[PDB]
Design a protein around this nucleic acid. Structure first.
Lengths: 74, 162, 378, 82, 86, 80, 165, 79, 68, 85
RNA sequence: GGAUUUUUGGAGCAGGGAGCCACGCAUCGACCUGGUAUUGCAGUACCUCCAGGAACGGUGC
C-alpha cells in the first residue's frame, strides 16, 4: 500500500481480533480494545497460547509496551 | 648506558606488525638486563636486538611478555629462574649470540609455554647432535630455528639420550 | 666464565653498597640512631649509643646538622640492603682466555665505567645538586607510601577508621576522641573490656582492617628494621605464650573467651570439640587482634603524638586550622632536599590588541612596538 | 499521580524491599529521591542464597527495586493526598 | 530537599555492588545524575566481602586504582570505612 | 556531569575499558564523547577466556561500557 | 625498503608465517610490517617492510636461499614502494639500472665487484679494473637487481655509485 | 553519505523483502515487506515469517507490526 | 542530540561486534545521532549479505580494518 | 492525560482503582501478584492491598502481603476479570 | 522528564550421572597426519585438493 505506518495500522486493527507475541515467547489472542502512545495494549476475551497451544482463557488484559515483540491481526 | 626506567620511559612504544604491544630497546649498548619493573608488565614482547647483554637474566615478574627478540647481543648464558619471572614466554629469538655448550641451553627446559625458539648463528649450533639435544631437553618447542620439530626427530632424540 | 671474576665483582659491589649506606649514616647519624632506638624496644638486647651522641647528632667528635629526608634515605638504604642481600645470596650459591682477549684489537674507546658507574650508581645526589636520591633509586617517592595526614610517620590517620567505626556501632554517640579512647584498650583490656562483643561480625571485620593498617604503617615508618625478624618474633610469641593471660582468681583465660580453674582443665580443654571449633574458625581474627596489640604497643609514641594532634586541631579556630593544614600540605609536597595618557596611546597607536604568531603566539599592544619586534633577540 | 512522591514521604518507616536481582532488604528509610534512589539505616540485607548481613547504612539505585513491602499500619489514604 | 544523601558519603571509603555481583571498594570522590561514580584507590573483590572469615578474608582481590564506574551497572553502596586523610 | 569532565581529561592517556560483555581493552584514549563513546588506539584486548589480541584502532559505544580505569595522574576536581 | 619473498612453503598458517618472518628478519633492522596472503595468486609469497633501507639490502644478501620451513627462500627488491612507506615519507628514469661512480678502491677488483655484482642475476656490465680499481660501472639487467646490489653495499665505508640518471 | 533511516525509506519504496535480526535471540529472525515505519523504527511488515535458523522451519504471520526494540539488524533478501 | 564522532571512519572497512556474540564486517556508509549505521558489502561471520542497517542500540564495539 | 488514563489501555488500572476490584499481575520475577489497586501511575508503579503473591518453585507457593509498592518496570501483564466477584 | 548512551528492565530459566577420573544435541572455527596442486610483486572476513584424525576451542538449549 501507499505508505502504511505503524500507528494507523494498529488503529485500523482496534476493534479486531489480534495476537501479540511477547519477547518472552508467550502469546495472547483477543480483541484489541485500544492502544496508547507508548504502545501499551488492551485486549478483551484474551486467550493465552504458550508453545502455540491454548493454555488459559483470561478475559480483559493490559500488556505493558516494553514486553511486546510484535502484533499480528488474526 | 645502563638499562633504566628513564631509558625505558622515552623508548619507542608501538603495536607491531604481528599485532602485539612491543617496546623498542634496540641499539642502546645495554650490557645488563635490569629495571624492567618500569615497563609495568604492559608489553607482549621486548626488542633487545643489537645490544651487549651477556646473560638472559634479571627479569621481574612479567606476565604479559610473550616475545623476546634478542638478536645480535653477546648472550653466553641463560638464567635459571626464567619461568618464575616469565611464565608465558612463547617465542625466544637468540640469533647471532655466544651460546657455546649444549648444557648452557638447559635452562630453557623450564619455560613451559616456549614454542618458538631460534638459536642460529651461535657456536653451539655446530655441536654434534645440537638439534636432537634441543628437541629432547626442550620438548615444548614446536618450531626450532624456523624448521618444524617433526615426530621422527622426537623419536630419534628419544633413542639417543633415553 | 671464570667464577673468580664473578665472585670478585660481587664482593666488590657489596663493599660499594656498605660504603654508600655508611656514607649516609655518616652525613646524618639520625638515620641510624632513629632506627636503632625503635629496634631497642623490639629486640631488648640491642645495644644503643650514648644519649649525648643521639642528641647532639654526632657519631664521634663532629655534631652534624639536623635534617621527610630521613625517611627517604631510610627507604633508599632499604632497597640498598635488598640488593646486598640478593648479591650475598647468589654469591653463596688462563692462556686460553687471554688469547681470546686479543679479539677486536682496533677499538678507539676509553673505558672508565666499571667502578665509577657503580660508585656513582649508589652515591648521594640531578646535574649537580638537586636531588639527594641516588641513580639506583631515582624513581623512589615517599608520597606513594605515606598519605599527607601521616606526615611521613609523624601521625597515623585514624579518622577513616572512626568513620568505619561509626558504621560498625550503628550510631553516632562516638567521637573521634572517644574512638581513640577505645583504641587505647589495645595486655588484657582489649580482651576483657572489649568495645563490642568479640564474636560480632562487623567488629571482627573492622578489627582486621585496622590491624592490617597499623602493621603496614609500622613497617612503613621504620624501613631500616628487618621486617621478617619482627614478624617471626611476634608469631612465636603468639604460639608459645599467647595461657599467657593468668588471673589469681579466675585462672587462665582463652582468646573461647572463657576462664579456667587450673592449668589442668585448661589443657584438657584445648583438645575439646569446642576449642577445636573456635580455634579453627576464629584463628585469623585472634592473630590479627594480637598483632594490632603488639604493633600498637611498638607505636605508643606515634599514637600519643596523633591523639595530641587531634586535640590541638580540635581546639583551633577557622583561620588556625586552615594555616595548620597549609603547613601539613607544604611539608607533604616539598623537595626532600632544598637548594593615564588615554588619547595619547590611541594617537601613538599603542594599547591596541595585536599578535605575532612566530613568537609564542605572543601579544603586542602597539604597532610601533611590533614593528620593533622585527629586530629583537627572541 | 507521581507515586515516587508517595515513597518520598516514607522517611523513618521500616520496610522490606525486594530487588530485581532477588536480594531482600529490610531497613529504615532515611530518604527516597525523584529517581526512586532509596537510602536506609539499620539495614539487614539478604542477598539471594546468603545469610543476612547488617549494615548501618545502604543506598539503592532506584531502578534496581522490584517492590516495597510497607508497614501494615501504614495509613495509605492519608499519604495519597497531595 | 537536601540532595546530601550522596554528598555526605563523599570522600569516604565505600563498598559498591555491581549488577553482575562484583564488589568495588574505593574512595568515593564524585558522582552525577546517572550515578556514574569516581572511585580512588579502588580494588575489586569477587568471592566475599569479609566479616572476618577465619580461613581468609580475601580471595580474588584485584588492584584497579582510579576507577570511573557507569551508573547503569551500579546496584548499591554502603560505607566501608572513613576517609583516608591524605 | 563531574565524572564526564574527568574522563575528557584522560584523553591522550593510556586507559583500560571493560565492556558489558567483559572484554578488556587497554590503550590510548583518543576521543571520549559526552555519552561515554570511546575512540582508542594501539589496543591490547583480553577476552573472557584469558587470550589476548592486538588492535590498531577501536571505537566502543558508551552504553555498552561497564567501566573505565584512568591514570592516577588525574587524582590530584577536589572542590566538589 | 620492502623485499619480496617467494618460494615459501604455503602449508604454514598465515599468522605463524608472518610471526616467523618477523622473527627471522628482525636481526637486520626494525620490520615495520609484513604483507602476506594465502589467495591462489599470492600464496607462497610475502612482502617484508623495513624502516631502514640498509636493513633491507643486508637482509636480501644474507638470507638469499635460506631454508625456511623446508624450502630455500628467494628474495628480491619489490617492484613498487609499499603503501606504508609512502605514507611515512609524505625525475622519470629512477629507479635506474646502471650505477657508475667511484670511491671503492683498496685492492678492490673486477672479479671482486664481478662476484658481488654476480650475486645478482642482473649481472650485466662490470667495469672495475684499471690502475684505478676505484671506478665502478655496473649495468644490472634490471633496477630491482641493480637496486638489490646497490642496497646490499649501499654505504661501502663512503663509496660513490651514481645510477646513470 | 547514506543515512540509516533513508535506507529504510528505500526498502519501503522498493518493496524488497527484508530480513530482521532480533535482539538477544539468534535462533529466530523475522522476514517481511516493509509497508511503513515510524520514528521509533517500529515496522509494519507484510506477508511476514518467523525463521528458525536451528529447525529450518518457517512460521507464517501475515500482517505484522514489529516493535523496533527487537531490531539488531536490517538486511534485504532476493526471495 | 549529539552526533557520534564517526566521520573519520566513513568509507572505511570495519569489524563490528554485536550483541548475541554476533560479528559482521563491512564499509561504513553513514550514521545518525542514535549510532544507527549503514554498512555496505556486509559479511556475516562467512556469507555476503550486501548493504545493511545496524541499529546503534545493538552495537557493542567497532574496530577499523584500515588506518584512519 | 487523564483522558489517556481513562480510555487508553491503562483504563484497566483506572477501572480497578475506582471499583476497588481485584487484578492479577503477571510479573517479571515469574511471580504473580493478586490484589487491589490503591494507586498507579504511567510506569505502572502501584500501591497494592490484600496481595496474594503466587509463584512456583515442581511446587506451588503463595504468601499474603497486606500493603506494598510495585515498581512498574516489573510488569509484564495486568489482568482484570470476574476475579473480585 | 517510560521509545536506541544510564532511572521505569532483554529478562527469565536449565547440570547431575557412572566407576580422583570421564561425560547429551546443534552450529562455526581454526587443527593434527599423510599425500598432492600452484613459482604467482601484494596491503587481506578464510583461502590448493584428496584421505584419515579430533580423550580441540567458543556459543545456545
Amino acid at each position: 500500500s501507499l505508505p502504511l505506518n505503524p500507528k494507523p495500522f494498529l488503529n485500523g486493527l482496534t476493534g479486531k481480533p489480534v495476537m501479540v507475541k511477547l519477547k518472552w515467547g508467550m502469546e495472547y489472542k483477543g480483541y484489541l480494545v485500544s492502544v496508547d502512545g507508548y504502545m501499551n495494549m488492551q485486549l478483551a476475551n484474551t486467550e493465552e497460547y504458550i508453545d502455540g497451544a491454548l493454555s488459559g482463557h483470561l478475559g480483559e488484559v493490559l500488556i505493558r509496551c516494553n514486553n511486546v515483540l510484535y502484533i499480528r491481526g488474526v | 648506558v645502563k638499562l633504566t626506567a628513564e631509558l625505558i620511559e622515552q623508548a619507542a612504544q608501538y603495536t607491531n606488525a604481528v599485532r602485539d604491544r612491543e617496546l623498542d630497546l634496540r641499539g642502546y649498548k645495554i650490557p645488563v638486563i635490569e629495571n624492567l619493573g618500569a615497563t609495568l608488565d604492559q608489553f607482549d614482547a621486548i626488542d633487545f636486538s643489537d645490544n651487549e647483554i651477556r646473560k638472559l637474566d634479571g627479569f621481574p615478574l612479567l606476565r604479559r611478555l610473550k616475545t623476546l627478540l634478542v638478536n645480535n647481543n653477546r648472550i653466553c648464558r641463560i638464567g635459571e629462574g626464567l619461568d618464575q619471572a616469565l611464565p608465558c614466554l612463547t617465542e625466544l629469538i637468540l640469533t647471532n649470540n655466544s651460546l657455546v655448550e649444549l648444557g648452557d641451553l638447559d635452562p630453557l627446559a623450564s619455560l613451559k609455554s616456549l614454542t618458538y625458539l631460534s638459536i642460529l648463528r651461535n657456536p653451539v649450533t655446530n655441536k654434534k647432535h645440537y638439534r636432537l639435544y634441543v628437541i629432547y631437553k626442550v620438548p615444548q618447542v614446536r618450531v626450532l630455528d624456523f624448521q618444524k620439530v617433526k615426530l621422527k626427530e622426537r623419536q630419534e632424540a628419544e633413542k639417543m639420550f633415553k | 666464565e671464570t667464577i673468580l671474576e664473578q665472585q670478585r665483582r660481587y664482593h666488590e659491589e657489596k663493599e660499594r653498597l656498605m660504603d654508600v649506606m655508611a656514607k649516609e649514616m655518616l652525613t646524618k647519624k639520625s638515620t641510624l640512631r632513629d632506627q636503632i632506638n625503635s629496634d631497642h624496644r623490639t629486640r631488648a638486647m640491642q645495644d644503643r649509643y650514648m644519649e649525648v651522641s643521639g642528641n647532639l647528632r654526632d657519631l664521634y667528635d663532629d655534631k652534624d646538622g639536623l635534617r621527610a629526608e630521613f625517611y627517604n634515605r631510610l627507604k633508599q638504604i632499604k632497597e640498598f640492603h635488598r640488593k646486598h642481600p640478593n648479591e650475598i645470596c647468589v654469591p653463596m650459591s688462563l692462556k686460553a682466555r687471554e688469547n681470546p682477549s686479543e679479539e677486536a684489537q682496533n677499538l678507539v674507546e676509553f673505558t672508565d665505567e666499571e667502578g665509577y658507574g657503580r660508585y656513582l650508581d649508589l652515591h648521594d645526589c640531578i646535574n649537580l645538586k638537586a636531588s639527594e636520591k641516588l641513580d639506583y633509586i631515582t624513581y623512589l617517592s615517599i608520597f606513594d607510601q605515606l598519605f599527607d595526614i601521616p606526615k611521613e610517620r609523624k601521625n597515623a590517620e585514624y579518622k577513616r577508621y572512626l568513620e568505619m567505626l561509626l558504621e560498625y556501632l550503628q550510631d553516632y554517640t562516638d567521637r573521634v576522641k572517644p574512638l581513640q579512647d577505645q583504641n587505647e584498650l589495645f595486655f588484657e583490656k582489649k580482651w576483657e573490656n572489649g568495645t563490642f562483643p568479640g564474636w560480632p561480625k562487623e567488629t571482627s571485620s573492622a578489627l582486621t582492617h585496622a590491624g592490617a593498617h597499623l602493621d603496614l604503617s609500622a613497617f612503613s615508618s621504620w624501613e631500616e628494621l628487618a621486617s621478617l625478624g619482627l614478624d617471626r618474633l611476634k608469631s612465636a610469641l603468639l604460639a608459645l605464650g599467647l595461657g599467657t593471660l593468668e588471673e589469681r582468681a579466675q585462672r587462665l583465660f582463652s582468646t573461647k573467651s572463657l576462664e579456667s580453674l587450673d592449668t589442668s582443665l585448661f589443657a584438657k580443654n584445648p583438645k575439646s570439640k569446642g576449642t577445636k571449633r573456635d580455634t579453627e574458625r576464629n584463628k585469623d581474627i585472634a592473630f590479627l587482634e594480637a598483632q594490632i596489640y603488639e604493633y600498637v604497643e611498638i607505636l605508643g609514641e606515634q599514637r600519643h603524638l596523633t591523639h595530641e594532634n587531634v586535640q590541638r586541631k580540635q581546639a583551633r579556630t577557622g583561620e588556625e586550622r586552615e594555616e595548620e593544614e597549609e603547613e601539613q600540605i607544604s611539608e607533604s609536597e616539598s623537595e626532600d632536599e632544598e637548594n593615564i595618557p588615554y588619547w595619547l596611546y590611541k594617537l601613538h597607536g599603542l594599547n591596541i590588541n595585536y599578535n605575532c604568531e612566530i613568537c609564542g603566539n605572543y601579544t603586542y599592544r602597539g604597532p610601533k612596538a611590533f614593528q620593533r619586534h622585527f629586530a629583537e633577540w627572541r | 499521580m507521581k507515586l515516587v512522591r508517595f515513597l518520598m514521604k516514607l522517611s523513618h518507616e521500616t520496610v522490606t524491599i525486594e530487588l530485581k536481582n532477588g536480594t531482600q532488604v529490610h531497613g529504615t528509610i532515611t530518604g527516597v529521591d525523584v529517581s526512586m534512589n532509596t537510602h536506609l539505616k539499620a539495614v539487614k540485607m539478604t542477598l539471594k542464597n546468603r545469610e543476612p548481613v547488617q549494615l548501618e547504612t545502604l543506598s539503592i539505585r532506584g531502578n534496581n527495586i522490584r517492590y516495597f513491602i510497607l508497614p501494615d499500619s501504614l495509613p495509605l489514604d492519608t499519604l495519597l493526598v497531595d | 530537599g537536601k540532595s546530601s544523601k550522596m554528598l555526605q558519603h563523599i570522600d569516604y571509603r565505600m563498598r559498591c555492588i555491581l549488577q553482575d555481583g562484583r564488589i568495588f571498594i574505593g574512595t568515593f570522590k564524585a558522582f552525577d545524575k546517572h550515578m556514574n561514580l569516581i572511585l580512588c584507590d579502588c580494588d575489586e573483590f569477587r568471592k566475599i566481602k569479609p566479616k572476618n572469615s577465619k580461613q581468609a578474608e580475601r580471595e580474588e582481590k584485584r588492584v584497579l586504582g582510579l576507577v570511573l564506574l557507569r551508573g547503569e551497572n551500579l546496584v548499591s553502596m554502603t560505607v566501608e570505612g572513613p576517609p583516608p586523610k591524605d | 556531569g563531574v565524572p564526564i569532565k574527568v574522563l575528557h581529561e584522560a584523553e591522550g592517556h593510556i586507559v583500560t575499558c571493560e565492556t558489558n560483555t567483559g572484554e578488556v581493552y587497554r590503550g590510548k584514549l583518543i576521543e571520549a564523547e559526552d555519552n561515554m563513546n570511546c575512540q582508542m588506539s594501539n589496543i591490547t584486548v583480553t577476552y573472557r577466556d584469558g587470550r589476548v589480541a592486538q588492535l590498531e584502532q577501536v571505537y566502543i559505544r558508551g552504553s555498552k561500557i561497564r567501566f573505565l580505569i584512568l591514570p592516577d595522574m588525574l587524582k590530584n576536581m577536589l572542590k566538589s | 625498503h620492502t623485499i619480496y619473498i617467494n618460494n615459501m612453503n604455503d602449508k604454514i598458517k598465515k599468522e605463524e608465517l608472518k610471526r616467523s618472518l618477523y622473527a627471522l628478519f628482525s636481526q637486520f633492522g626494525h620490520v615495520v610490517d609484513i604483507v602476506a596472503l594465502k589467495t591462489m595468486k599470492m600464496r607462497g609469497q610475502a612482502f617484508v617492510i623495513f624502516k631502514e633501507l640498509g636493513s633491507s639490502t643486508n637482509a636480501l644478501r644474507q638470507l638469499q636461499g635460506f631454508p625456511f620451513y623446508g624450502k630455500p627462500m628467494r628474495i628480491q627488491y619489490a617492484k613498487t614502494d609499499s603503501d606504508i612507506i609512502s605514507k611515512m615519507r609524505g625525475p622519470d628514469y629512477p629507479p635506474n639500472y646502471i650505477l657508475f661512480l667511484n670511491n671503492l678502491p683498496e685492492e678492490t677488483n673486477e672479479m671482486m665487484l664481478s662476484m658481488l655484482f654476480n650475486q645478482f642475476p642482473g649481472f650485466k656490465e662490470v667495469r672495475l679494473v684499471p690502475g684505478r680499481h676505484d671506478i665502478a660501472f655496473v649495468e644490472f639487467e634490471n633496477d630491482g637487481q641493480a637496486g638489490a646490489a646497490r642496497d646490499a653495499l649501499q654505504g661501502f665505508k663512503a663509496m660513490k655509485i651514481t645510477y646513470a640518471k | 553519505m547514506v543515512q540509516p533511516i533513508n535506507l529504510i525509506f528505500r526498502y519501503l519504496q522498493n518493496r524488497s523483502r527484508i530480513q530482521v535480526w532480533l535482539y538477544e535471540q539468534v535462533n529466530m529472525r523475522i522476514e517481511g515487506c516493509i509497508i511503513g515505519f515510524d520514528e521509533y523504527m517500529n515496522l509494519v511488515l507484510d506477508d511476514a515469517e518467523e525463521i528458525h535458523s536451528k529447525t529450518k522451519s518457517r512460521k507464517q504471520l501475515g500482517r505484522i507490526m514489529l516493535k523496533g526494540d527487537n531490531i539488531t539488524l536490517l538486511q534485504s533478501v532476493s526471495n | 542530540a549529539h552526533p557520534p564522532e564517526l566521520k573519520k571512519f566513513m568509507d572505511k572497512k570495519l569489524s563490528l561486534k554485536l550483541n548475541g556474540g554476533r560479528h559482521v564486517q563491512g564499509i561504513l556508509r553513514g550514521f545518525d545521532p542514535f549510532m544507527n549505521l549503514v554498512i555496505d558489502e556486509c559479511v556475516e561471520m562467512q556469507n555476503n549479505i550486501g548493504m545493511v542497517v545496524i541499529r546503534g542500540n545493538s552495537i557493542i564495539m567497532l574496530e577499523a580494518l584500515e588506518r584512519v | 492525560e487523564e483522558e489517556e488514563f481513562n480510555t487508553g489501555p491503562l483504563s484497566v488500572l483506572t477501572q480497578s482503582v475506582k471499583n476497588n476490584t481485584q487484578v492479577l499481575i503477571n510479573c517479571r520475577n515469574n511471580k504473580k501478584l493478586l490484589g487491589r489497586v490503591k494507586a498507579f501511575d504511567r510506569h505502572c508503579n502501584m500501591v497494592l492491598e490484600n496481595v496474594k503473591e503466587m509463584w512456583t518453585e515442581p511446587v506451588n507457593k503463595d504468601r499474603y502481603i497486606s500493603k506494598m509498592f510495585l515498581r512498574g518496570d516489573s510488569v509484564i501483564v495486568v489482568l482484570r476479570n470476574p476475579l473480585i466477584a
